[PDB]
Amino acid sequence: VNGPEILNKYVGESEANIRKLFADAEEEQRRLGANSGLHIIIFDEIDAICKQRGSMAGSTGVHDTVVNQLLSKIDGVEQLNNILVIGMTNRPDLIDEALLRPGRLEVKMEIGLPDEKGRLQILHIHTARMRGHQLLSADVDIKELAVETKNFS
Amino acid sequence: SIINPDWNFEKMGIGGLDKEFSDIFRRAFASRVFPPEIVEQMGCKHVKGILLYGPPGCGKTLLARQIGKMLNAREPKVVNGPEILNKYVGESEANIRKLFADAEEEQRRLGANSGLHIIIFDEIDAICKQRGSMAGSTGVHDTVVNQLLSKIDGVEQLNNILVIGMTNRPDLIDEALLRPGRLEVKMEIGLPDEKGRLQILHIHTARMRGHQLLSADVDIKELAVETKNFSGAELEGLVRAAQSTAMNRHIIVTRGDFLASLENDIKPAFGTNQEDYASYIMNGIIKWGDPVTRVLDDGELLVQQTKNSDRTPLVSVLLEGPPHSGKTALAAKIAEESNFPFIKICSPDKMIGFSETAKCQAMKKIFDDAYKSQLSCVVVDDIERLLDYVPIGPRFSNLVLQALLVLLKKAPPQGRKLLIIGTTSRKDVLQEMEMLNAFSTTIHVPNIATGEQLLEALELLGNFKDKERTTIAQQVKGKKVWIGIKKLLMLIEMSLQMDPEYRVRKFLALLREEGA
Amino acid sequence: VNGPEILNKYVGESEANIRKLFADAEEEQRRLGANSGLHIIIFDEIDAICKQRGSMAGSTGVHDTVVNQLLSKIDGVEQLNNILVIGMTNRPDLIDEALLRPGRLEVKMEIGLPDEKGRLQILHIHTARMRGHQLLSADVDIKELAVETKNFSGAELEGLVRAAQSTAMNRHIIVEVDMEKAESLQVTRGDFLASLENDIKPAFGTNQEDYASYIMNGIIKWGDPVTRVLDDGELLVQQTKNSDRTPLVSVLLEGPPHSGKTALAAKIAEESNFPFIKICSPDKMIGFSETAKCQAMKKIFDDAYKSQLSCVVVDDIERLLDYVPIGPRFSNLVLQALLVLLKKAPPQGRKLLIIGTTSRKDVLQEMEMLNAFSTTIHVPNIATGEQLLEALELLGNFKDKERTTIAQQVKGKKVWIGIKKLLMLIEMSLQMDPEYRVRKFLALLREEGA
Amino acid sequence: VNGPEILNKYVGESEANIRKLFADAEEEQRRLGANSGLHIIIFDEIDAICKQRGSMAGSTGVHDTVVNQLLSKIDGVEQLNNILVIGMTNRPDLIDEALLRPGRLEVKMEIGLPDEKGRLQILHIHTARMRGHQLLSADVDIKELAVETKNFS
Amino acid sequence: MAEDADMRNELEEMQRR
Ligand SMILES: Nc1ncnc2c1ncn2[C@@H]1O[C@H](COP(=O)(O)OP(=O)(O)OP(=O)(O)O)[C@@H](O)[C@H]1O
Ligand SMILES: Nc1ncnc2c1ncn2[C@@H]1O[C@H](COP(=O)(O)OP(=O)(O)OP(=O)(O)O)[C@@H](O)[C@H]1O
Ligand SMILES: Nc1ncnc2c1ncn2[C@@H]1O[C@H](COP(=O)(O)OP(=O)(O)OP(=O)(O)O)[C@@H](O)[C@H]1O
């Protein structure tokens, strides 16, 4: 799911487009208690869904109900053990400690520009498809490409 | 016959909170566990509400799940937050009423002697906010709130309900809904003390201990000593990660040893960060002379002045001087060496490109979080930037200033304490602007005044050696120097990147610029 | 009806569910004209429906239709006399006045907080069955509760009752026991736990323990001036209680900073024995835009006017209106509202007093507020060592030898400080050692004096 | 018409209730047309039923636009000289420009807060039955009461 | 935002033969 797309202007649809992600797995919990299979969820851009909630005022409360929903879902009264939730973004400082605390999102990770070494393995993969063909061999050495490409992603 | 509600509960599932469960129990469940022979002689209406407010963590929803899982009422109709809300009108409210309908049916047909019904509002703060001023004058949530509180204490005189609510912001809820009769008990469960924490960290470990696991070397008392404010659930997060480390250890009969030692550095906490200091103190601290020790032992003095005292729960201190003189670093070192659970920084670094109101809010948040815990030393860095001051024209952020100042003048709750710190590069504008009056005192941090100090600073750093250092010492003989060391270091490296021929002469030619 | 239950997604049935109400009584009115048995209605939280028809700012709702229909059906073309519509709300002003004019709703009687007499009856009811069934002990009569209950309202009044009987019930029940074992013992009295749980129940009006933050250390009688101040306060406060035609009174407690104006202000508020007190202070309202700050101040006073009596304590006015000495900038709206509210006359003999505080009179004199304040008070901070060390005795720290040690230095010389600073001075000096404590204190005391 | 009761969920019924409202009238127009019944309707609280043709009042669904059917029946191609409608409002300006003009709504006039003279006359009407009775309204001095009571109406 | 866009819909099918 892309964050910017589930937000509908008409109230109720925005938050209720989330419970669908969890409902099928909840039904699986009703049927199979502890031996169910996982159901993975991927929030591709979460910082639009979630931001720091307003405090001590009626104002600045816009778009907080969504957070109040999914926080209630992933650890609520119906203790739901079969789902691992992914989140991924580029602004890790906008998001609640209320969400980052253990039980909701246990671990935070960093993935950044790999390095010449990382690029080298990337090039091994995407070249290796051609290696499988074996057509794409022109005495092209990968170290040229690595040391030439310094910041590339 | 009559059926007892709880039936088999024996203080399991939680720990850390016994007084709080008791203060809920006597208020809510005592009237329901008692011989009803004399209850009508007593003329009591069974209370219809419980509220839980607190920070993230601290086990509130576990409490609420326990009461309703253990109990034999066996009728829980949890609400998941704004699940009520629907696009079409009338559905939002009727989704409330289809909760209470079953209970109201039972009560109508079966009377005073009846079973129980429980409703568990998770994150009540979204649907129920204060009527009258909300996202505009009218707002959307008037309907659901006026329905809810028309219903709980309504015309029907209904009993046979228990409404549990959870939230993180107890102030947003309206007094019409919080007053006695609808929701009586508003508990303040917060970070536990070491004795409570030990109970937590014993029950999350007993399921390991029943089987022979967790070799005897680990002592949970030490863990309770070195985990003062983990905000609850980070304890079981620690334990889960420890399971994980032992687990990927025995990979080609596992045990968990020194789990706290391994985990504590890795796990962030609501309280202090383990080490986020490197940004402020990257290169460490070199004491060049006596003023360093003077300011620093003054700091630890003023520190123990908080713990060992009453009737002054906070002491605020400005430690200022000319620019480039390590004002932030000394604050950080005071905080580090002082062994405070809630050390935090409010650096304008974090808050940039913010309107002054949002700046205010990101500054009040941390003080509220400090009011949670027992002790703290908060530090404000570069106040002249935090409240923007520009010499060319007098323009500043009134709102942030006023907030900061009253926050200095804010008596925290009974028992709690603060060691607020503030740094400036300029003090005269504050003398104009009334900030200094609020502060208890001032700690000047002089620039390097004498080359006699400078030379030992250089040997402490360890870059130059006796031969050239003789030359520099000879040149600085008798003259006075006015230099901040955060500028010095820059001059050092700007020297070292020239060859040894003109190394020292570039250094000294740049040095003589300042000259004051 | 429970208010909004009437509303439904389908169009025309929302108001049909209203029409279903009166279509059960109009038949009786039709066939038995006069002799009928008074069909009636009970609304609740009527504000959601039945507000002014121009509410489309934020609402954008069809509820116009609802109020038009009801407003039509009650008076209407057809006359039906045997209808009683009972309506109740906490926010009355949102209503459409057209349904509220006489003939539809003529009696708009509004209930008021129970007075110190009537709460006797309120408590007496809920204790009647008890003291008839020989539960309650005789030592606690209800007057002792009533006079202690300042602003308890209704459910807040009966809450302590229910909770105290619940505490007396709890004692019998008793942790890790497999069963909570209620020893079946009939003896349940509820003797003093009401007087305990007066601690536990805060009302909205005043919280007797919310003064700890302001008065942390209590009041110290360092000298005669503070006695003079409190005397002036009390003889100024008997004014409102025992007068007419001065229903508002307005004072200021000004003085140099760090002198503790707010503290003795709240002590005046206590010793006045008023029902209703407030401390309108910035320490709660921080980061509030000027409009929200002003509307909070107006909520304070619209809460006070409800009461027969009231006192308010405006704390650090200069910060309340965000005064800054350089490049003077000042909340214009807050100043204007704060000034108007001093000379607002409460409607029907209600008595209010305002206790303003600040560190500086000059800005108020320039802002034309001092004459708005009716009569002002100065707070002379400690100007003398002979007063200083007397206060130091009333504290107890810096015992006799240290007292004598500083006595020579300050007995014949000036010392101009406030005691807010004094506390912090002594606490800081006390840390290092007994021997070094007095010279630290004194060199510090000479450092601060410019 | 006790406010809106014509509105109903099934579209076409809201629009079509009015033909039932006018049917007997146009029947008497066509059959036995010269001397007629002169039927009347009261049509209270137009502020609910009529609006600015659906443009205003938010997004009022086309169910709201029953004004079109009303217009066409009162002054459309088929015309009626045998019936008159009445209107009653508290907020006339909210009505569309169309109806208020002649042929549809010929006469418009406020009912104002009456002067002292009219207030005396109305108070006299209510008190008259009691005054007629021998034992009531002694020393009441309705003219004094009138001059006392300034804006009551 | 333009919040409180709450709207209602009507039956127009009335399926019957
Ligand atoms: N007494 C306790 N001490 C420490 N951790 C607890 C305790 N009780 C529950 N936990 C942990 O708390 C989790 C669920 O309750 P939690 O504290 O997350 O609610 P909450 O934090 O108030 O809700 P929110 O996250 O919305 O603030 C469980 O996963 C459990 O591990
Ligand atoms: N007492 C001290 N002795 C030696 N070095 C110090 C001392 N205090 C700070 N430093 C050095 O200062 C460096 C950090 O500078 P810092 O960020 O404090 O500059 P600053 O004082 O904030 O200047 P500015 O206020 O202009 O930003 C650290 O790497 C640390 O070595
Ligand atoms: N007799 C007394 N008169 C004044 N203050 C006293 C007295 N006894 C004790 N105090 C102290 O006064 C303190 C409150 O002073 P307060 O905070 O009102 O001053 P302030 O208004 O903050 O000064 P400033 O406005 O300069 O900051 C209390 O903490 C209390 O210990």
Side-chain angles (χ1 to χ4, degrees):
Chain A
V1 174
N2 290 317
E5 299 290 358
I6 63 173
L7 281 77
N8 191 357
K9 188 182 288 294
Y10 297 160
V11 300
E13 296 294 326
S14 67
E15 300 86 21
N17 205 161
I18 292 166
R19 293 190 299 277
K20 294 178 176 64
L21 283 64
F22 298 103
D24 59 357
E26 283 175 353
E27 185 64 27
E28 263 184 11
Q29 285 297 112
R30 270 71 171 170
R31 195 174 62 251
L32 280 72
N35 59 2
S36 179
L38 294 180
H39 294 282
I40 301 299
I41 291 93
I42 308 300
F43 291 105
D44 186 74
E45 188 67 25
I46 196 167
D47 60 356
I49 298 166
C50 296
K51 64 181 179 67
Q52 188 67 43
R53 294 192 300 280
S55 178
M56 60 77 202
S59 62
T60 315
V62 64
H63 296 303
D64 62 355
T65 61
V66 176
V67 178
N68 296 115
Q69 184 62 255
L70 65 86
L71 296 175
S72 176
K73 294 298 292 185
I74 60 174
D75 53 350
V77 180
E78 190 68 27
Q79 186 61 253
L80 184 56
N81 206 161
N82 64 2
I83 63 173
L84 170 148
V85 71
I86 304 300
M88 70 180 69
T89 186
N90 57 7
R91 295 180 180 88
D93 57 355
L94 276 295
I95 298 93
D96 290 328
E97 182 64 25
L99 189 147
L100 293 180
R101 56 161 288 265
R104 293 170 192 274
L105 272 292
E106 287 293 328
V107 60
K108 296 183 285 181
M109 292 297 295
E110 68 282 16
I111 58 179
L113 282 277
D115 212 351
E116 75 175 344
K117 270 82 72 175
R119 286 188 283 288
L120 187 280
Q121 289 101 28
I122 295 168
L123 291 168
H124 279 175
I125 295 165
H126 292 172
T127 54
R129 190 282 198 276
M130 300 308 175
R131 193 57 50 86
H133 274 70
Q134 190 263 332
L135 279 310
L136 189 261
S137 183
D139 193 74
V140 65
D141 188 73
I142 307 300
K143 301 294 186 291
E144 294 181 354
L145 304 172
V147 176
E148 184 177 1
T149 62
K150 293 183 183 294
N151 195 8
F152 294 180
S153 65
Chain B
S1 296
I2 299 165
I3 306 174
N4 275 311
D6 48 345
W7 170 254
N8 199 201
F9 94 111
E10 67 183 325
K11 299 310 302 295
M12 301 303 302
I14 63 91
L17 303 172
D18 290 330
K19 179 176 73 174
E20 291 81 1
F21 181 76
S22 179
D23 187 74
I24 293 168
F25 184 74
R26 67 180 178 84
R27 299 295 303 277
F29 294 91
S31 66
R32 293 184 184 277
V33 60
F34 188 80
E37 183 63 26
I38 66 91
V39 71
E40 69 275 16
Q41 306 286 317
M42 183 175 286
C44 182
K45 289 176 72 175
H46 301 285
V47 68
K48 301 183 287 295
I50 297 168
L51 182 62
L52 278 300
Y53 63 85
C58 298
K60 61 182 79 70
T61 185
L62 182 63
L63 191 153
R65 187 171 67 243
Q66 186 181 1
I67 60 174
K69 191 265 183 183
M70 304 307 297
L71 280 53
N72 186 26
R74 65 174 286 280
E75 298 183 341
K77 293 179 294 300
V78 63
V79 172
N80 295 116
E83 181 179 1
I84 300 302
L85 306 184
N86 192 10
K87 180 180 177 181
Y88 301 158
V89 62
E91 293 293 328
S92 64
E93 61 87 21
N95 195 356
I96 304 290
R97 180 173 66 254
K98 298 181 285 179
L99 302 173
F100 299 92
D102 292 359
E104 180 184 1
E105 191 273 331
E106 183 176 0
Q107 187 66 41
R108 296 287 181 86
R109 66 172 173 82
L110 198 144
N113 184 331
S114 282
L116 184 60
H117 297 273
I118 300 164
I119 299 168
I120 298 164
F121 289 102
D122 192 359
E123 294 294 329
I124 193 169
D125 58 357
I127 60 173
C128 295
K129 290 186 284 182
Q130 187 173 3
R131 183 175 61 255
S133 61
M134 173 184 76
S137 178
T138 300
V140 65
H141 301 92
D142 292 335
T143 301
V144 301
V145 174
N146 290 117
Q147 190 274 341
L148 188 150
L149 66 91
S150 62
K151 187 170 282 292
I152 296 171
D153 190 358
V155 180
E156 294 296 358
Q157 187 184 357
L158 63 85
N159 292 319
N160 187 351
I161 193 166
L162 180 62
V163 173
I164 297 166
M166 281 81 77
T167 185
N168 295 320
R169 283 85 59 83
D171 59 357
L172 298 175
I173 309 300
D174 53 353
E175 299 290 328
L177 189 141
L178 294 178
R179 91 294 187 279
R182 294 189 176 91
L183 294 176
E184 294 293 335
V185 294
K186 57 184 78 68
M187 294 296 289
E188 197 262 329
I189 64 177
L191 282 78
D193 210 2
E194 64 93 24
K195 182 186 87 270
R197 184 159 52 255
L198 191 156
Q199 293 179 357
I200 305 299
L201 190 60
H202 187 276
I203 64 168
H204 289 290
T205 305
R207 181 61 61 84
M208 292 181 183
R209 185 178 295 106
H211 300 166
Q212 186 173 3
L213 294 71
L214 89 130
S215 292
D217 50 23
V218 58
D219 292 331
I220 59 172
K221 295 183 263 73
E222 296 293 328
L223 275 67
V225 169
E226 278 92 9
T227 53
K228 314 281 292 186
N229 63 351
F230 265 9
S231 172
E234 296 179 354
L235 297 169
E236 61 85 19
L238 188 148
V239 172
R240 187 179 297 118
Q243 291 179 358
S244 175
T245 51
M247 189 175 288
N248 69 352
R249 184 181 68 192
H250 76 279
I251 62 96
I252 192 68
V253 68
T254 189
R255 300 288 192 274
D257 291 334
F258 292 92
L259 67 174
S261 299
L262 303 159
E263 291 303 333
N264 284 129
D265 61 351
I266 298 301
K267 295 292 101 180
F270 164 86
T272 181
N273 295 113
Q274 296 294 322
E275 293 297 329
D276 61 355
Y277 292 165
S279 298
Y280 300 98
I281 57 104
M282 63 185 74
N283 288 318
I285 293 168
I286 294 169
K287 62 180 74 65
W288 60 87
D290 294 331
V292 178
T293 60
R294 191 266 299 167
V295 304
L296 196 149
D297 69 0
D298 190 359
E300 77 187 2
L301 187 156
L302 182 73
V303 169
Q304 61 182 357
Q305 184 270 336
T306 60
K307 295 190 289 294
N308 293 316
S309 66
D310 196 74
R311 67 181 69 187
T312 180
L314 61 83
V315 292
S316 60
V317 302
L318 183 52
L319 73 169
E320 68 89 16
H324 305 109
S325 177
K327 291 159 296 79
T328 62
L330 277 307
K333 183 65 182 295
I334 291 164
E336 188 175 2
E337 186 64 25
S338 56
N339 296 113
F340 271 96
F342 196 72
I343 71 89
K344 178 170 275 65
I345 296 166
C346 192
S347 178
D349 182 356
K350 292 180 183 179
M351 55 190 75
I352 63 94
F354 285 99
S355 64
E356 62 185 1
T357 303
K359 192 181 284 185
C360 296
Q361 295 289 111
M363 179 169 70
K364 79 177 287 294
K365 184 175 75 68
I366 63 174
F367 293 168
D368 290 330
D369 293 332
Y371 296 156
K372 299 293 189 292
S373 69
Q374 298 292 322
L375 280 70
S376 64
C377 65
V378 178
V379 308
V380 175
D381 292 330
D382 294 331
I383 291 164
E384 67 274 17
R385 296 295 84 178
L386 185 287
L387 70 85
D388 188 5
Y389 178 84
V390 195
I392 179 66
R395 56 185 59 257
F396 56 96
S397 179
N398 201 165
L399 283 174
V400 311
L401 191 152
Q402 296 289 328
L404 182 66
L405 195 146
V406 66
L407 292 167
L408 297 174
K409 299 289 181 68
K410 181 67 179 294
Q414 185 66 40
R416 281 77 180 275
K417 297 181 185 290
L418 277 78
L419 198 155
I420 295 163
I421 299 293
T423 64
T424 58
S425 179
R426 63 182 64 258
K427 189 176 85 273
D428 57 354
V429 301
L430 279 64
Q431 281 288 108
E432 292 179 353
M433 189 168 68
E434 291 186 344
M435 186 170 284
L436 281 176
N437 193 347
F439 283 108
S440 298
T441 181
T442 60
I443 296 166
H444 190 272
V445 289
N447 283 324
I448 304 302
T450 61
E452 193 275 330
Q453 291 176 357
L454 190 148
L455 293 168
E456 186 175 1
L458 292 177
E459 81 186 1
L460 286 164
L461 191 147
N463 59 4
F464 294 171
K465 300 293 178 69
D466 59 357
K467 183 66 175 66
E468 63 186 359
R469 186 174 291 163
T470 303
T471 304
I472 289 91
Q474 184 60 254
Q475 293 294 320
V476 299
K477 296 295 185 182
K479 277 71 68 177
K480 293 180 176 66
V481 291
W482 184 257
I483 186 168
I485 59 170
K486 187 257 182 66
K487 184 71 173 177
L488 181 62
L489 274 298
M490 191 64 73
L491 296 171
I492 293 293
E493 294 290 324
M494 193 182 289
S495 65
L496 290 176
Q497 296 291 104
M498 187 178 288
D499 291 331
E501 294 293 328
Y502 291 90
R503 177 69 62 81
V504 176
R505 287 184 291 278
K506 182 67 180 293
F507 177 78
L508 190 280
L510 294 172
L511 190 286
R512 296 291 185 187
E513 293 292 328
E514 291 82 1
Chain C
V1 302
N2 301 116
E5 66 93 340
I6 302 170
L7 302 176
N8 63 350
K9 60 175 286 292
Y10 295 113
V11 67
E13 295 293 328
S14 65
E15 66 271 21
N17 207 160
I18 291 165
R19 189 177 299 107
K20 290 300 179 291
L21 302 175
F22 297 160
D24 291 330
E26 68 186 1
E27 291 287 357
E28 287 75 357
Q29 181 67 42
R30 186 178 294 111
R31 64 181 177 87
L32 280 71
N35 203 161
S36 177
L38 194 138
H39 294 280
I40 61 167
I41 305 296
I42 297 166
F43 296 163
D44 192 81
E45 290 304 353
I46 190 180
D47 59 12
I49 59 172
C50 297
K51 59 177 73 174
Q52 186 63 255
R53 281 78 57 82
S55 178
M56 293 183 286
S59 68
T60 309
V62 176
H63 69 276
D64 297 334
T65 299
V66 174
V67 64
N68 292 121
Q69 182 156 359
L70 184 62
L71 182 66
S72 178
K73 286 187 79 70
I74 296 167
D75 193 358
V77 176
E78 64 183 2
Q79 288 290 328
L80 71 166
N81 300 325
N82 58 350
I83 192 70
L84 260 81
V85 180
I86 296 167
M88 66 190 77
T89 187
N90 295 315
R91 294 178 67 85
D93 291 331
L94 280 71
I95 61 91
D96 187 4
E97 193 273 329
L99 66 84
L100 187 142
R101 59 86 163 169
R104 293 181 180 94
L105 299 171
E106 169 178 2
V107 63
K108 63 183 76 66
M109 187 62 68
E110 51 79 21
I111 319 183
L113 298 172
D115 58 354
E116 299 296 328
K117 184 266 289 294
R119 66 186 70 196
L120 191 149
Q121 294 178 358
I122 301 298
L123 193 288
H124 181 80
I125 296 298
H126 297 171
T127 53
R129 189 177 291 174
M130 292 178 181
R131 189 172 62 256
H133 297 170
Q134 294 85 21
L135 294 175
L136 183 61
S137 178
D139 59 354
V140 294
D141 65 330
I142 65 172
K143 298 181 289 297
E144 184 176 1
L145 293 172
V147 175
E148 193 274 331
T149 54
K150 297 289 100 176
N151 296 118
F152 289 88
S153 66
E156 291 178 353
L157 191 287
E158 69 93 21
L160 64 92
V161 177
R162 185 173 61 245
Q165 63 181 3
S166 181
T167 299
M169 190 180 288
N170 187 10
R171 171 177 59 263
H172 298 109
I173 313 298
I174 296 184
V175 177
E176 193 172 1
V177 186
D178 290 344
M179 293 295 289
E180 291 291 330
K181 297 296 292 184
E183 63 186 1
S184 296
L185 296 176
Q186 190 271 330
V187 174
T188 61
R189 294 186 177 91
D191 191 357
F192 290 104
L193 279 296
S195 296
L196 186 150
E197 291 173 352
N198 286 319
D199 184 75
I200 300 299
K201 296 294 101 184
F204 66 91
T206 186
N207 294 323
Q208 192 271 331
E209 193 266 329
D210 197 2
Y211 292 160
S213 296
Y214 296 97
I215 299 165
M216 291 186 284
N217 315 329
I219 309 302
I220 57 170
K221 187 171 299 302
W222 54 276
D224 293 331
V226 67
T227 303
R228 191 266 298 166
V229 169
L230 293 172
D231 191 359
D232 288 333
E234 193 274 329
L235 64 88
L236 186 146
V237 168
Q238 68 182 358
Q239 184 178 0
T240 63
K241 190 181 286 184
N242 291 318
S243 179
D244 57 356
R245 72 184 183 188
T246 305
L248 63 88
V249 65
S250 65
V251 301
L252 179 60
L253 294 174
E254 64 90 20
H258 293 286
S259 181
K261 295 172 262 71
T262 303
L264 59 88
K267 180 62 73 180
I268 293 164
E270 285 181 353
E271 295 294 328
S272 60
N273 195 1
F274 282 112
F276 186 79
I277 66 92
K278 294 295 289 183
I279 295 166
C280 183
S281 63
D283 58 356
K284 296 291 179 71
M285 57 186 76
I286 64 94
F288 282 178
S289 64
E290 294 178 353
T291 61
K293 188 183 285 184
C294 181
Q295 290 179 357
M297 291 171 68
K298 186 172 73 175
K299 182 175 73 67
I300 299 297
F301 294 174
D302 296 359
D303 291 331
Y305 296 163
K306 300 293 187 290
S307 177
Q308 180 59 250
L309 291 173
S310 174
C311 78
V312 295
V313 177
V314 183
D315 183 73
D316 287 330
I317 293 164
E318 64 185 1
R319 301 297 163 190
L320 182 52
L321 48 91
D322 300 321
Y323 180 89
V324 172
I326 58 89
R329 61 186 72 195
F330 57 92
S331 294
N332 204 164
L333 279 297
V334 175
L335 189 157
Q336 294 287 326
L338 189 151
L339 193 152
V340 170
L341 294 164
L342 297 172
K343 62 179 74 174
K344 183 177 288 296
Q348 292 181 343
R350 289 166 169 79
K351 264 67 173 302
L352 172 66
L353 82 160
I354 306 177
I355 308 302
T357 68
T358 187
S359 179
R360 59 183 66 254
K361 288 190 288 185
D362 57 355
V363 299
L364 298 173
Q365 180 63 43
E366 294 177 353
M367 289 175 180
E368 297 292 329
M369 291 170 68
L370 189 65
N371 59 4
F373 290 158
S374 298
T375 187
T376 187
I377 295 164
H378 188 273
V379 177
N381 61 3
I382 291 168
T384 58
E386 185 63 26
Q387 290 169 350
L388 189 151
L389 58 89
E390 185 177 1
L392 189 59
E393 184 177 0
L394 275 74
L395 291 170
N397 290 314
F398 289 177
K399 190 172 262 75
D400 57 357
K401 297 300 297 297
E402 291 81 2
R403 298 181 58 81
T404 58
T405 304
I406 62 172
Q408 296 78 2
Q409 293 196 358
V410 301
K411 62 184 198 62
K413 282 92 162 63
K414 65 96 179 175
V415 63
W416 179 68
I417 58 166
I419 55 165
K420 180 68 181 295
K421 182 64 70 175
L422 184 64
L423 273 297
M424 188 178 284
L425 290 170
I426 60 171
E427 290 288 349
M428 192 176 306
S429 182
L430 161 69
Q431 302 300 113
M432 309 73 67
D433 256 330
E435 192 283 340
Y436 285 102
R437 193 175 307 171
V438 298
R439 65 177 63 86
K440 182 69 181 295
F441 180 77
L442 191 281
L444 187 65
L445 181 62
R446 294 294 87 192
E447 191 275 330
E448 63 88 25
Chain D
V1 176
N2 291 316
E5 64 185 0
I6 62 95
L7 281 79
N8 193 358
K9 65 182 76 66
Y10 295 107
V11 67
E13 198 281 333
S14 65
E15 298 289 329
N17 202 344
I18 303 181
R19 65 192 64 263
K20 186 183 264 75
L21 189 62
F22 293 160
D24 59 356
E26 66 183 2
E27 183 178 1
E28 294 293 328
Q29 182 65 43
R30 297 280 75 76
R31 184 263 189 189
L32 188 62
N35 205 140
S36 305
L38 56 93
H39 316 273
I40 301 179
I41 58 169
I42 303 301
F43 193 67
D44 192 358
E45 293 296 330
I46 292 97
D47 59 353
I49 300 168
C50 297
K51 299 293 180 182
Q52 288 63 355
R53 301 166 290 101
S55 301
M56 297 298 292
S59 179
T60 63
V62 296
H63 59 83
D64 184 12
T65 64
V66 297
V67 50
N68 296 147
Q69 197 288 338
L70 192 151
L71 293 170
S72 178
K73 296 295 288 186
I74 63 173
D75 68 348
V77 180
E78 184 64 26
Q79 67 184 16
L80 293 172
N81 293 319
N82 186 28
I83 60 77
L84 68 69
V85 307
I86 293 164
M88 290 171 65
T89 61
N90 300 116
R91 297 181 72 192
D93 58 355
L94 274 293
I95 299 166
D96 59 356
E97 184 178 1
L99 277 77
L100 280 72
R101 68 170 62 170
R104 292 192 286 271
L105 294 178
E106 282 287 344
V107 59
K108 304 176 280 71
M109 62 185 179
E110 65 185 1
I111 306 299
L113 301 169
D115 61 355
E116 287 280 330
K117 187 274 297 298
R119 197 176 299 115
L120 188 284
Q121 190 176 4
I122 185 172
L123 193 286
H124 163 108
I125 303 179
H126 299 276
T127 63
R129 179 192 289 273
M130 302 183 288
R131 191 172 61 267
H133 285 75
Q134 73 280 16
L135 82 172
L136 305 173
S137 80
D139 195 75
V140 69
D141 194 355
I142 58 171
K143 291 181 180 179
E144 188 273 329
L145 185 64
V147 63
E148 191 276 331
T149 183
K150 182 61 67 178
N151 201 358
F152 289 0
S153 60
Chain E
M1 281 74 77
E3 65 274 17
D4 192 355
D6 290 329
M7 60 183 286
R8 72 283 302 281
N9 193 358
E10 64 277 17
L11 295 175
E12 68 275 17
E13 67 279 18
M14 189 63 203
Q15 184 65 41
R16 182 262 180 85
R17 59 92 172 173

